[PDB]
């Protein structure tokens, strides 16, 4: 199937920013050496949760550094940037890499991103939906324009021209179902939380499906994704331990990210949470290989999806992060099998 390495660029309290940038590049490289066929990047501004707030650029560095590896942006936050500028970037990316770029998009979760990038807070879905069109249009026509409460710019030419016909492959990181719907309407492949479970997942699908179908798509080729967090070790106990700590941090970090909350600044115009996450390691590849293998097949056999992408930063260190990917490469990788 398809394997992917997921990278957040989360900064551990013991690693300095530099340290993290270095480890970040090393992993991007090592990826393929470990049997992974795509490296996926998360985008995140101003905090330790993610230091890498410009996936296109990062992507270009690794894409350039490699012959065959694939790179994707797990989550480009659609609204916060200018469609034209994004189109040019994806297009450059696609053309320079010769089609090795995966354009995973997302809607936008933190406020901050919006209060600073100066974008429309409520319209979050509209925007994404709209930006997407312009971009789309630029993708095969070769031109772009507007005319809405969103933006307004006249017909311009677009360079360079898309390498991959119709543009780079698009993916949606969707949790909400309004969003599950949105995707389906255009039948886009997608990425699944690692916080949810089998039923939950399988259930999002169906939903995706009744739409996909209503619009005549072949659910047979849409490549979705099983995204997880991984912890491969022989001591199931360490694997899970380590993992438990990670999620404290993650969670805490995650929370803090709801920061700029002291009212002396207006987003007025001119120009929250879920439930238990600390136990979500029970539904992901954490523990011995045997344990990982099972947990995975299960989601597989239930969705049909053959692309699972994992994140190993939890092991923290650069070394451990590797061992646990090599472990997986030898011990989990071989043993998985396609759907029903």
């Amino acid at each position: 199937m398809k394997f992917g390495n997921f990278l957040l660029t989360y900064q551990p309290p013991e690693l300095s920013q530099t340290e993290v940038m270095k480890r970040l590049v090393n992993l991007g490289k090592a990826s393929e050496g470990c049997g992974f066929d795509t490296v996926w990047l998360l985008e995140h501004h101003f905090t330790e949760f993610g230091l890498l707030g410009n996936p296109y650029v990062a992507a270009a560095h690794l894409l350039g550094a490699t012959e065959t590896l694939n790179v994707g942006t797990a989550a480009i936050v659609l609204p916060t940037a200018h469609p034209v500028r994004q189109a040019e970037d994806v297009n450059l990316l696609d053309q320079m890499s010769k089609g090795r770029f995966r354009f995973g998009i997302c809607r936008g979760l933190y406020d901050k991103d919006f209060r600073v990038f100066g974008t429309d807070m409520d319209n979050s879905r509209a925007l994404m939906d709209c930006w997407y069109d312009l971009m789309k249009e630029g993708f095969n026509e070769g031109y772009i324009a507007a005319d809405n409460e969103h933006i307004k710019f006249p017909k311009i030419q677009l360079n360079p021209s898309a390498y991959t016909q119709g543009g780079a492959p698009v993916y949606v990181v969707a949790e909400s179902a309004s969003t599950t719907e949105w995707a389906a309407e255009r039948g886009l492949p997608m990425i699944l939380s690692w916080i949810i479970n089998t039923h939950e997942k399988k259930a999002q699908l169906d939903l995706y499906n009744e739409v996909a179908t209503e619009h005549g798509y072949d659910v047979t080729k849409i490549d979705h994704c099983l995204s997880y967090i991984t912890s491969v070790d022989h001591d199931s106990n360490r694997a899970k331990d380590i993992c438990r700590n990670f999620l404290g941090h993650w969670y805490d970090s995650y929370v803090n990210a709801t920061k700029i909350f002291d009212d002396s600044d207006q987003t007025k115009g001119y120009d929250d949470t879920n439930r238990r996450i600390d136990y979500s390691y029970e539904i992901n590849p954490v523990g011995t290989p045997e344990e990982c293998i099972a947990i995975i097949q299960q989601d597989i056999d239930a969705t049909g999806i053959d692309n699972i992408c994992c994140g190993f930063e939890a092991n923290g260190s650069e070394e451990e992060i590797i061992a646990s990917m090599k472990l997986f490469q030898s011990d989990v990788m071989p043993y998985l099998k396609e759907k029903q």
């Binding site: 940038m21 650029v57 560095h61 053309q95 100066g118």
Partner: protein, 319 residues
Amino acid sequence: MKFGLFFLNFMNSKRSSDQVIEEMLDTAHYVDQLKFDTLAVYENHFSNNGVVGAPLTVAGFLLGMTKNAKVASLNHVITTHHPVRVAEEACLLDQMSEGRFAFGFSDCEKSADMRFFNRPTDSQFQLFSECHKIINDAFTTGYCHPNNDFYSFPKISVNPHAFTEGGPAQFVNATSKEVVEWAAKLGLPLVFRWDDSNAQRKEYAGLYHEVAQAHGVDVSQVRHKLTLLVNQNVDGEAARAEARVYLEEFVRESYSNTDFEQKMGELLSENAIGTYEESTQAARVAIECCGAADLLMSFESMEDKAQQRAVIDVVNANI
């Protein structure tokens, strides 16, 4: 005394986005093993004269792809952008490549662009001057607090912070008299435009100097660069015909029938176009008129790869 390349990536009816983009990449790969110390990329939007709008990206790709050259964005128009993006991108580039990225920016030239990006003009310069403050703050502090008539948001950290203390090496592009002033005050190098007349570079050059003086800065150190187009052929007429065919649109675009003929002949004579003896001589005068410590040439116009590639070795073997 440093040398290097630069790509404008002009596309035509004869060379397409795909062609150019590759050729560029193809060349950066070659040069890498030579003594060229820098590669720069020209930012251009919505026309055939420059098939790149995000110089920082390409920069990343080339950075990821090379082992020896510093790589730099030639004229990143920060005037039409969000200083944060900019800063994040820049430190990022500095961080990932570990000190091999140089940051050349600039104010907005084409009027339009400014319009297309909601940029009013009544503030064009101040707006520019500002973006830089910030970009610059971050670089130095790892943080920022705008609160200006241009931009306001709460204070923030701007990650990744920056490898290089103070930030990557910076430079400004010499587009207006008022910019060389400002730039001089902070005592920061410039990059002289190959499309500008020898005289122009002079004024500016001098201007810089005069101002550097009057305020205090000891620019004895500052190193500026200059960009020039190279094109040599043992048949001077040929090198001239090719180049004009090559700049034809650039000129109708940028120097609006001001005397297409006049302007053109001048670039045709001031750039390093001709036969070796013609080319080499012209370089020389250009350098002298503006006093640049660094020369960034561009061998693009040369259609035949072998010759183009043969022009490079030559310029290489010099050193």
